[PDB]
Design a protein around this ligand. Sequence first.
Ligand SMILES: N[C@@H](CCC(=O)O)C(=O)O
Ligand SMILES: N[C@@H](CCC(=O)O)C(=O)O
Ligand SMILES: N[C@@H](CCC(=O)O)C(=O)O
Lengths: 174, 135, 116, 49
Amino acid sequence: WFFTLIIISSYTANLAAFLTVERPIDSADDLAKQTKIEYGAVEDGATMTFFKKSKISTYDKMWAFMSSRRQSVLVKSNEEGIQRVLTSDYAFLMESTTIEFVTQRNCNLTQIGGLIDSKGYGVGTPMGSPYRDKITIAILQLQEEGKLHMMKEKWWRGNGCPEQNIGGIFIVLA
Amino acid sequence: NRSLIVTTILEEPYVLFKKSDKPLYGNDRFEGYCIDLLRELSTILGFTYEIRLVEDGKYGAQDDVNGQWNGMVRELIDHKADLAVAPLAITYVREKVIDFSKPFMTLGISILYRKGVFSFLNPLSPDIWMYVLLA
Amino acid sequence: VREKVIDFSKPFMTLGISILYRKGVFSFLNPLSPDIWMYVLWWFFTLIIISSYTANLAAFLTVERPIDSADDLAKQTKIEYGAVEDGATMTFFKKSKISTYDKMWAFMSSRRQSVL
Amino acid sequence: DSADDLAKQTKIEYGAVEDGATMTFFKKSKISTYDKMWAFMSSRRQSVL
Ligand SMILES: N[C@@H](CCC(=O)O)C(=O)O
Ligand SMILES: N[C@@H](CCC(=O)O)C(=O)O
Ligand SMILES: N[C@@H](CCC(=O)O)C(=O)O
């Protein structure tokens, strides 16, 4: 009796530690403070340049990491970055629009945290081009008429990806 | 009038090569959101155009030691393209050297990453379940 | 920073920055799931269950998922915090070299559109 | 398993050859793990270098 008393006490105590401990990347800060999970960005794009120029401590620390490890963690395309997330312990700094497309099609992937910054995509022109203001007005017309939203839905069609123990003792009973 | 030269870059779902069995030529090779945008702009503004992939495969950044740009941004600086129609971010450093329309889409940088009855046999080791039965 | 660019009278009021904040039998039905209470409704079987309930309840009493200072806010992110944009309190945090306050500034700056 | 695991603790001491390249790597590094390690090694230098 004293023997079984100790055992059942041990089982209970031990089972508690596994439940106590049972009770996680959520932000850039979480990446910046570690190195086991590598991270990076598209070389020679805007995301890279944001980190390269930033004076914000979290982002400056991330740039120092990406610069150090750049032959491995800076990639030449979003496609390459995605393949690194899928095939290694790697988080990819990517624009949110593109993340929305990727996560609707790769259901094992997700966006971590929110937006780090805010920017737009625009049609580029040489400095001084007369087309710049004409394209602005055309874009505003397309937005207001609903055509840009229709185009996003079209190219953004990803109707996919969502956004015990005690039992074992029952079977041995029956 | 002269067709405008439009620089772009492959990036799904903005700009892609169309799938087909017959070979495709010229502008007919491409599809995507930015291709549909370009088609709409061309109809509203009354221009024709020729799509060309940026030869270096880059969006564009400035070299820190020699100060030269690359990518689509450099194509515009050098007047080798009339327009860049692509998911091209409007940024401080770029707006000092090229011009941009107001945005057709808004976004931000974020992070892409990943998301047993044997939990009953673990607490008390298999070796222990055995001995407790032998005893 | 302001006295370097404008000129102030001596004070009419003295003050400092501080923090403004706010001041179930179902915790018994949680440890052992409603689904489990059902199925449970033989000695070795009940032994395991009561042991599980005890162990699990202990976990609950340990973690159990009190703010007294800026240090307590700085160490966490569940409770957000901020300040008036473009005022003296914001600028105090923005300029501070003191570890607690520099950590708070990093948080406020990150989340500025929501917390300033 | 890693430098990160050493950096996060102080029970196990760590160090390097004084006035060599490894020491200088830590002394110069901006990478958080390695800068934390340098602070430890510098503090405890008479014993760990
Ligand atoms: N859209 C970016 C490239 C992708 C990125 O930097 O995340 C650019 O205009 O440079
Ligand atoms: N009284 C402050 C504004 C309020 C604050 O910063 O808390 C000032 O002079 O800027
Ligand atoms: N080989 C090193 C010395 C040994 C070390 O620093 O680990 C040097 O050239 O400084």
